[PDB]
Design a protein around this ligand. Structure first.
Ligand code: NA
Length: 357
């Protein structure tokens, strides 16, 4: 089939999709992958053909912009047409389009999936409610006949309530050759990864606090600071630290013993796939959920931003990295992450979805 998968312009949502695109073309089908040009090159590598086409601090009304991409993307509606369209759950436009074309739909859940019995967001978030109705042409995100969730089922909140419409394939990570090549003997020195990723780009005191907390400690520390800070700015970088704007995460996680992260779903599932315990410091609401989920599942510790100190970072790292039972549960969750089936099982469920008709 000619498959069209519609996704928003955000890195977090597109990585899980790429490995699926890679698997699909291996199975034979062809994808038109609508995306913003910035995101176009990553699409190409895994195969498929995607034809190209801000800040989220504001509280409501983001879709219309997604309604603006609906026509822009729908210009190609006519030239090549789908037999199956897959849309990221946030990218509303793909359904509208899809509804109009009455093609089978498959929803992508980058983040937790929800069902009638279980919903996401607090009452305050809940309270906003699709208030203004404009003039053109129900519930914003219900479940499609088949929804692929990029996490093991055991990680899903209220996983008991979830249907056969929901396939929990875990993170979609392929098999690839390491960019990192980080090599010297470890020395048996525990490797800590610190990355807040995209969030907290305005909090340089955090990275300074990490340096103060762990300089000249038993740990070896890799700290991805993004452009939040500039490595040269600091007076003295400790010998046991390695500070970059970016690092190959999957790579370092496979050699790490602890991961201080921001609770992004991609970063969390990668840590789970590598079986690395977590200290989660969340910024956005979804991260707060993931941070809570990590805590309740016993996979690590949830360190709220308002409590992050030199001491709290040390205390957290020490508690986590010293709890062997926590390491076991992390291992058990890693095992679930691999059994989840990945892009392989995701692709298979799409093909078997098409036989049903
Ligand atoms: Na807590």
């Amino acid at each position: 089939y000619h498959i069209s998968m519609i996704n928003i312009p955000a890195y977090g949502h597109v990585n899980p999709t790429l490995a699926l695109v890679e698997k699909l073309c291996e199975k034979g089908h062809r994808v038109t992958y609508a995306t913003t040009e910035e995101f176009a090159p990553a699409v190409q590598q895994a195969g498929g053909e995607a034809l190209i086409y801000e800040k989220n601090d504001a509280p409501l009304s983001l879709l219309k912009e997604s309604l603006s991409i609906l026509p822009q993307l729908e210009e190609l509606y006519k030239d090549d047409q789908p037999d199956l369209i897959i849309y990221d759950f946030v990218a509303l436009a793909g359904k509208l389009f899809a509804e109009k074309l009455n093609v089978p739909v498959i929803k992508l859940c980058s983040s937790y999936a929800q069902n009638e019995s279980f919903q996401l967001g607090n009452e305050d978030m809940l309270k906003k409610i699709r208030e203004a109705e404009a003039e053109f042409k129900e519930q914003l995100a219900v479940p499609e006949a088949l929804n692929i969730v990029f996490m093991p089922k055991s990680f899903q909140i209220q996983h008991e309530t979830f249907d056969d419409r929901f396939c929990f394939v875990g993170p979609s990570l392929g098999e690839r050759k390491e960019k990192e090549s980080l090599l010297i003997d470890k020395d048996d020195r525990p490797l800590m990864l610190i990355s807040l990723g995209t969030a907290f780009n305005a909090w340089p005191e955090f990275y300074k606090m990490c340096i103060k907390a762990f300089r000249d400690s038993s740990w070896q520390v890799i700290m991805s600071v993004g452009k939040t800070i500039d490595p040269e700015s600091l007076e003295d970088i400790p010998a046991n630290f390695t500070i970059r704007q970016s690092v190959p995460q999957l790579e370092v996680l496979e050699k790490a013993d602890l991961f201080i992260s921001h609770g992004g779903m991609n970063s969390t599932m990668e840590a789970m796939n590598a079986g690395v315990p977590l200290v989660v410091i969340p910024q956005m609401y979804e991260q707060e959920l993931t941070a809570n989920r990590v805590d309740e599942l016993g996979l690590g510790v949830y360190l709220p931003k308002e409590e992050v100190t030199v001491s709290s970072l040390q205390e957290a790292v020490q508690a986590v990295s010293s709890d062997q039972e926590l390491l076991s549960r992390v291992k058990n969750m890693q095992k679930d992450v691999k059994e989840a089936g990945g892009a392989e099982r995701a692709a298979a469920e799409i093909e078997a979805f098409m036989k049903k008709s």
